[PDB]
Write a protein that binds this ligand. Structure first.
Ligand SMILES: *[C@@H]1O[C@H](CO)[C@@H](O[C@@H]2O[C@H](CO)[C@@H](O)[C@H](O)[C@H]2NC(C)=O)[C@H](O)[C@H]1NC(C)=O
Ligand SMILES: *[C@@H]1O[C@H](CO)[C@@H](O[C@@H]2O[C@H](CO)[C@@H](O)[C@H](O)[C@H]2NC(C)=O)[C@H](O)[C@H]1NC(C)=O
Ligand SMILES: *[C@@H]1O[C@H](CO)[C@@H](O[C@@H]2O[C@H](CO)[C@@H](O)[C@H](O)[C@H]2NC(C)=O)[C@H](O)[C@H]1NC(C)=O
Ligand SMILES: *[C@@H]1O[C@H](CO)[C@@H](O)[C@H](O)[C@H]1NC(C)=O
Ligand SMILES: *[C@@H]1O[C@H](CO)[C@@H](O)[C@H](O)[C@H]1NC(C)=O
Ligand SMILES: *[C@@H]1O[C@H](CO)[C@@H](O)[C@H](O)[C@H]1NC(C)=O
Lengths: 509, 509, 509
């Protein structure tokens, strides 16, 4: 074949790429590397959350558990929980027919509590010459009993003196106090249990006072015609609460001393509780990741990636080194192998390819490729580390009659997810174009430094290569790659060669 | 005239620019085309919403309609609605002076409902040896009557036996049950209507229980001194509800089986209900658009563009082809005509203008321009189609005494709008710079490919044009345009011409 | 030193930088100037808010103030407030033991009130033949007294006739109406004060009706064993309210006409009230800035920068004029002085540096720099001026029992702040890359312009400079700078010089 000038090319060195990204302007762009911004894996189980175990309520509802239905696990030894797991259809709810007042708010406050201790508020003896009602509805191991937290005060010897009890919160923390009223199905039952005419109960702190009378009538709860209503109050430190009754009162025995609460979630049973720990629990499973987005489950609690409605989002890190870059004046070469291999993050080289009489080869330019790795590392770290806010669900606990406020809370969570989801999808598409164009600008900048060093000693072939107008052996090549080439040294030889080339004619003149 | 070299210019072809955009860095930039991102057109009427008609409550309030004020249109035949339209001063509210308990919640749940069916819960005969009170306050076809949904139980022959009724929700769906209590103005009226001393009403499900006694005294509603309180509960499947009364109960007759509810809005009357269908209904009119933003009305319901506080936002799609582009080394030509017309999205071509002895002309480069159309299309489709979230108002239904929560919910809607408003205004400005810059970059790329083809056979005039150093007739120009021109074919002629040009002296040596 | 050709260099003229910023891809980039996007300075005091004074409740709680505890300053003369400052341990609350119903809602609506006036609802005479109860718990002006806004109706001559009174809202505005019920500690006290058996109060509008009976028993408030409960209603124009009692009513005397309410905040005492005015009040102090973000305090009210969780964010405006730009083909010079000084926005100039046999000098290119100032100004103004939404806290007032809605509101506030926080941090990083890159493109364009004018009469040195192939005295330099230089003028000279330099040999041939 005809003789050819020695040649040096500046551009990309990499292997063949398989994995593509999308950019705002282009689809299915092959690049040498990328990262996934979205977490899709999870444990598929309920785990501890940041070292703190949840409580699985098993066969019991929250209400049954918190009031102390003796068919439920006692909470005498509980110290903390991160979240609760509850069976919507748990069999053991309130053992004796009744309801809990404001129980959506109570669920929300006990969804997680970081410091919890059950405490005896008032000893059973304080109420005086009374006895304690028990019921087959609320059995303890086959014996008739009652909620662990309350005392059903009833007549002794057919008398019911006025009873009184009080509790001062001296614990230095918040204390949950529970009490109730039993409403008889008949006047006969009321007369029998409580004796006194027009029984009343009066409960007060220095901030509020409530008075309760009996609401007589037949109800349709299972296993009883009468009915109980349960009430609660969270006392701040220094509060005082007093109870007085001539009949009806289900007296407070045990309360809960609680600190750092409302910090959990009531998740639904089904998914299994496993021995494991995660920094982000969702209803599908626990997530352990350094990714800042997840597309698994909107219902999430803890140190979480933001949920987004998205498929995977691949953030380009490497090079667009495909055959067609030549149409933009860029050079690239493909090679299964180099030496010291390819850099991890960008997979991985700006560099040179040469040809002279001694042969061919490729060589990386470490200094420029390092500035690129730094720029890419800086970009990725800024996108990731600046997302340092709070991204678990915006969510509350609500009961059956709180549909409006439940709906609006869930909508605001959805609206916040919509802003994040669009922003994430666009940032990635935009930044992918900017990263690919950044690699191009970098190699073009290297190409211009070479152009500048070669001056009139080389023809710019417009494809990222230079044809050198003198003999350029491996030592010459290495002076070009290492920035020490001096065009003066070869001026005589180069002007003679340029003259010779200028005179060649494809069709004879 | 003096001799001139044949010439080819690479750049923009288009007609005159009638369309200006703003960019992050410049105002009033003329471009050959853009698209509007914000919808400003609407029907000015209330329409069907994605195939589902609303209900115009006409001269009735929601309360009147829902309890069945006989002056209001029966809902016996209604099966569904997308939203409600209500006159805030409708004359027909509760016909007999009264109130509906928790009516904000009730409004919110009935704002729209996908499957609705009225149902007779309990036959009027079940209540026993009672009669039914009617009233001139509630006339039906001129006759004294009562709400369709309730039965005013009163004595028969100066007897009022205890009445009982119950309803088992066996429907597989949610059942709204309504009931009330009448509170006499005097003990005399209470004795006359209900007979029994201290009459009571007891209503209960297995989940809750309420007991109601009469609250006697004169009220100020129009046409009556007495007063009614209406109450409701939404039963889930399997629930059971019982009624018992010795006087005062306004007994349940008709309830409503409902599925997929709380999905609507209660819009205010004034704007007219037209025969039409839209995917997004606002209080101003229906919006039928593929735009993703609207600036018409914040109160919007359905598959909606997100409401933003903004003027129109023009996204540039076409070319910055103005005379001043030459200051940045770019060529452009303005033509009222080109064979085959201009492309739709960019309203302009990348391409060529030429001059030689045969004459002058312009020609589109189809390959480059097509690549641009793909890029702009992909860009637009991303910006638009990635916004597939839920952008109608974050809003609820609240009554007069629910001001705080209403205020808060509205502020959240507004803050969400403030996020999207800024994001939209800025994205457009930013993306317009990118788009106009991308077009430049694309024609600079063409110009460079030609530069590379012509090599030393053309002088780069720095204005987008090359002065060709040989005769280049139409055939030769087509080889340049179609990428087959071979500089070697004209090497002798081009060298001779260059030598001649270098020898010329404007001012004689 | 050897003879050198005359030279002109195109690029940046400025002083040493001393100012750094970060970009998405690089940290600590020295720039000639930047601006701070985040406000960090505040008054450290409570000020008037946009000309409207707050109210410092001093040693009274809001309840105590609004009901008119005589220990609290009278609000007879108040016309408005922008916000309230309250001691959470204020000693003067309700002077007689009691509670205010729905007091969190009340706090929220009175948090700031733009038009307020106290008004006499019902003259004391209306209630008929009763006397006014007073108490040492509520002393005023040396004597037992009672709340300013209420009258404790008690018997006269051991009779308590049924009292009645009404108020019609004909103010055209909303009117806050307060009433109460006294609950005796004993039957003996009830029979003594009110005489009648089973005393009742009936309070009704045309929209609702409430009946209150006495709740007898001993409470634990300081200084009294009985208890009062206080109620309110906000009447819209046209509303009518009626009161009737046979014992217990604390009758309404003064109410409040209000307009544009719910607009404030209840800040906590501590920070002192000062004679100042600002547009944005935070719990840390007043903020008077045109910046659109602040990192001072999340609890902020008014015309506010958005609170973000961020350090300072420095937006690049000036030039990246550092020695290493020459590696990217760019020229810059550093100088202390230039005729007329540096432009303030970018600090300072695109321009020229020359050298010939008359000496060396720099000169600004005013036309290209002004374009850059316009571009940056336009950028800044878009970023700032398009943030014209509402950015103070998403917040409400709640009482102690309203923990869940308070937590959820505060969470929404936080999640909105999290969006703006990430967005502001990224946007500054991204725009800084784009600003410095824009300045680079601008000077490269000026350089290309000069390149085009010099044509073959100059050697492009690839560092921003041109070696001119002829003598170019200062007049010649000036024709280059002002775009009148004509290469034809120096063609003969330049070709002779080029041919000379081509023949020179560093090592003799
Ligand atoms: C709860 O606290 C109160 C104080 O608020 C206690 O009542 C005081 O009891 C002391 C004697 O221990 C008396 O000297 C005071 O006169 C009482 N003060 C008041 C204001 O009533 C009460 O004993 C404490 N209750 C419990 C269960 O410990
Ligand atoms: C509502 O459901 C209850 C419970 O299924 C029905 O009461 C049952 O009625 C049958 C027929 O008389 C008796 O044999 C059962 O013993 C009853 N069960 C209970 C638990 O009482 C009741 O009839 C249903 N009511 C209506 C109106 O459908
Ligand atoms: C409040 O308004 C009511 C309703 O307008 C007034 O009651 C009317 O008083 C007029 C004038 O004396 C009578 O002729 C009407 O018959 C009344 N109508 C009704 C329905 O009551 C009442 O006087 C007003 N109250 C006050 C204190 O101004
Ligand atoms: C550059 O390469 C030449 C040839 O290998 C070598 O002799 C010289 O030391 C190198 N200079 C630098 C700075 O590495
Ligand atoms: C390009 O134009 C030349 C000159 O007219 C023509 O003969 C040739 O076939 C064309 N080639 C292509 C690839 O269109
Ligand atoms: C440019 O420079 C020349 C020489 O200094 C001067 O005479 C002339 O007026 C200038 N031209 C313009 C257009 O400013």
């Amino acid at each position: 074949a005809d003789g050819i000038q020695d040649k040096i090319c500046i551009g990309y060195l990499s292997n063949n790429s398989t994995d593509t990204v999308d950019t705002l302007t282009e689809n299915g762009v092959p690049v040498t590397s990328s990262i996934d911004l979205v977490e899709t894996n999870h444990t598929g189980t309920y785990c501890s959350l940041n070292g703190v175990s949840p409580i699985h309520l098993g066969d019991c509802s929250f209400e049954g558990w918190i009031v102390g239905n003796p068919s439920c696990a006692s909470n005498i030894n509980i110290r903390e929980w991160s979240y609760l797991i509850e069976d919507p259809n748990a069999p053991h709810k309130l053992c004796f027919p009744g309801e809990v007042d404001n129980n959506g708010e109570l669920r929300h406050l006990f969804s997680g509590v970081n410091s919890f201790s059950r405490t005896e508020l008032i000893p059973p003896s304080k109420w005086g010459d009374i006895l304690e009602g028990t019921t087959a509805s609320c059995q303890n191991r086959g014996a008739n009993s009652f909620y662990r937290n309350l005392i059903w005060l009833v007549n002794k010897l057919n008398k019911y003196p006025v009873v009184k009890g009080e509790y001062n919160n001296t614990t230095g923390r918040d204390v949950l106090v529970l009490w109730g009223i039993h409403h008889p199905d008949t006047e006969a039952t009321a007369n029998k249990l409580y004796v006194n005419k027009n029984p009343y109960t009066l409960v007060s702190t220095k901030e509020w006072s409530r008075r309760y009378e009996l609401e007589i009538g037949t109800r349709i709860g299972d296993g009883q015609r009468s009915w109980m209503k349960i009430y609660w109050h969270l006392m701040h430190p220094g509060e005082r609460i007093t109870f007085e009754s001539s009949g009806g009162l289900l007296a407070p025995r045990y309360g809960y001393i609680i600190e750092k609460y409302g910090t959990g979630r009531i998740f639904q049973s089904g998914v299994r509780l496993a021995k494991c720990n995660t920094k982000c629990q969702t209803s599908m499973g626990g997530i352990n990741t350094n990714k800042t987005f997840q597309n698994i489950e909107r219902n999430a609690l803890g140190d979480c990636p933001k949920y987004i409605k998205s498929g995977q989002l691949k953030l380009a890190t490497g090079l667009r080194n495909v055959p067609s870059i030549v149409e933009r004046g860029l050079f690239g070469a493909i090679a299964g192998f180099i030496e010291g291999g390819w850099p991890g993050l960008i997979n991985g080289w700006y560099g040179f390819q040469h040809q002279n009489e001694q042969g061919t080869g490729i060589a990386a330019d470490k200094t420029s490729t390092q500035k690129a790795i730094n720029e890419i590392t800086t970009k990725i770290n800024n996108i990731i580390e600046k997302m340092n806010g709070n991204y678990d669900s915006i969510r509350g606990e609500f009961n059956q009659v709180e549909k409006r406020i439940n709906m609006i809370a869930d909508r605001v969570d959805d609206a916040v997810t919509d802003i994040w989801s669009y922003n994430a999808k666009l940032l990635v598409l935009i930044e992918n174009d900017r990263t690919l164009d950044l690699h191009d600008a970098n190699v073009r900048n290297l190409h211009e430094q070479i152009k500048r060093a070669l001056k009139d000693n080389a023809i710019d072939e417009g494809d990222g290569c230079f044809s050198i107008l003198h003999k350029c052996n491996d030592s010459c090549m290495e002076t070009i790659r290492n920035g020490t080439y001096n065009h003066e040294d070869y001026k005589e030889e180069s002007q003679l060669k340029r003259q010779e080339i200028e005179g060649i004619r494809l069709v004879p003149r």
